[PDB]
Amino acid sequence: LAGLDTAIILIAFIITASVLAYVAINMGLFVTQ
Amino acid sequence: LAGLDTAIILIAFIITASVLAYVAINMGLFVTQ
Amino acid sequence: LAGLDTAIILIAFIITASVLAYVAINMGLFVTQ
Amino acid sequence: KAKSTINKGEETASTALTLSGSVLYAVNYPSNTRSYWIYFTVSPSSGVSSVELSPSTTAISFTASAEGISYSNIYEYTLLTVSPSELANQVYANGQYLDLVNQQTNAGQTYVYYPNPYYALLALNYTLSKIDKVSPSPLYITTTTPSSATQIYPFLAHDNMFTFTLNISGTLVTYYAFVNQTFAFTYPVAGDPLIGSAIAPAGSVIGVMILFGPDLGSHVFQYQTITIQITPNIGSPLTISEYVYQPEGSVSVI
Amino acid sequence: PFLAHDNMFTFTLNISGTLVTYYAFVNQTFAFTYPVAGDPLIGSAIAPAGSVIGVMILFGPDLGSHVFQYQTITIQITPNIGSPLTISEYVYQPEGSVSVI
Amino acid sequence: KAKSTINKGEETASTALTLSGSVLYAVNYPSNTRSYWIYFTVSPSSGVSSVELSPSTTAISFTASAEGISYSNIYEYTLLTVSPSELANQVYANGQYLDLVN
Amino acid sequence: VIGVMILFGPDLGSHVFQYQTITIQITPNIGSPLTISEYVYQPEGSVSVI
Amino acid sequence: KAKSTINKGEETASTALTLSGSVLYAVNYPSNTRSYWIYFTVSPSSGVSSV
């Protein structure tokens, strides 16, 4: 069984995406403003 | 499992481009007027 | 053994990645049209 | 245990706060020496979810690199928590009590908004005096002449004063405001059926006003860059960045 | 008595060949919207595409005592869904008592 | 959750408004000191979507650069909600009624 | 393809959902359950699309 | 007994529904006061199993 391991990698991926997500909104709003 | 994470990385980015599109056309309708 | 567990989980993870493709193409069509 | 943590990680990516309206800026126009206030409205991006704006779990950071200032968490009070019932009566301009708060009703839910930053300011003057007991009053808006205010209260001279005149019952009434520390507050402007909750719903419009104190109000921004960062507890920060050098009248536009 | 602090503007109409005048009284600056072109769904308070919707800003006592002269007047509409409409005009001087500005 | 959210993100980028018609300004002409009213029209950006202008949600703002006076959500009422059956019943200035809503 | 049709009654049909999250969840006896959760803003068309 | 468990464990990991087709909410349009019904279609996830 490996799903017990997939959870750790998965949650970490979501954090990297979230951080990248709003940094785009932060800089995206900046350049437009 | 590339499904669960990339599904969120998707919506984490779809919302990002949505805000950028929101503020981009916001500048557009302002200057033309 | 873990061979049956790995076999069972393999069936589960495919379905989630499959249904993600189901919705990914649908919204890709609707938005593009 | 994994499920809840992945579920919670999903909710984080759906905050999506943005900027609406404009970024006004008003100073003493003839002698551009003092800075009074900054007011800009801030709304959620689209119909994604409700965002949190509580002053206990949010940071608003003001900084200007060209002069070496950097403030953090100047976010102190809000007017979202106060109910319009208690605020309805106790304000007397002349003859009759003027009503600051407005309200509507539709689809079984009532709405609350404020028509002016001035009416929102006066509503803020009363609520700090009576609703939430605090020993230091960061703002004190009075109708007495500023010279008289210095006589009745000594320590009202260090703060920075700026006036806003009105017209009630046909007589021109003036007002004076004194701020002793740079702080910021919020008040609902549109589509906020959640009074008292301090959670901006989807598509709503919220106001954000920053009142300059004495330490910072003595400086005017010329050829400098401004950075205002509204950092909620979860999700996307918002970094208002602008470059201005002159006021262009009594108030600016950007 | 309390209708003395409000603002006033007069408009007349000719009904059944007779001249009738009307006088206004407004105590607060506000604005309202009414249908003006091709709005089938009335009552739902929705503006479909193709339908023009009129907007009328009424002055009041707090502001009507002044007159906008050589200044940038800025009105802005912000719907709940979509990007706001920010109007920014600059006026020299009104003419005819109804000016296009 | 992703699908429903993508559907709304598309709806946000589609709707917009334009200034159809001109903008009018009413002020006492001979002695230009009294403001009367400001009127104009508005319509969706184009044939893309139906926007809702219920005053409970949308908010018309206002500000003046010279006099420094600023406002927020001067939009209070509308006439879209009423039905033409209710208006045309009773109103007149003479012995005969008149119809307002065509 | 099967079709599900929820018929509101007098207790719930007297309301209208607005700026809310609506959740439906079908649960068979074997296999995962389906979890539908949409956020309705404003009903339009007399047949809302969401 | 261990055989029936795996035969049933596989079906649990294989059967799953999915929402195909939009969801329809019907209310009185001129005056949004009532609520009529909600309709939507469901189908198995893929060509994997019946529910």
TrEMBL record, chain E:
It is found in: Archaeal flagellum. Belongs to the archaeal flagellin family. Flagellin is the subunit protein which polymerizes to form the filaments of archaeal flagella. This is Flagellin. The chain holds residues 205 to 305 of 306 of the full protein.
Automatic annotation (TrEMBL), chain F:
Coiled coil: none annotated. It is found in: Archaeal flagellum. Flagellin is the subunit protein which polymerizes to form the filaments of archaeal flagella. This is Flagellin. It comes from Saccharolobus islandicus (strain REY15A). It comes from the Archaea. Belongs to the archaeal flagellin family.
From TrEMBL, chain H:
It is found in: Archaeal flagellum. Signal peptide: none annotated. Flagellin is the subunit protein which polymerizes to form the filaments of archaeal flagella. Belongs to the archaeal flagellin family. This is Flagellin. It comes from Saccharolobus islandicus (strain REY15A) (Sulfolobus islandicus).
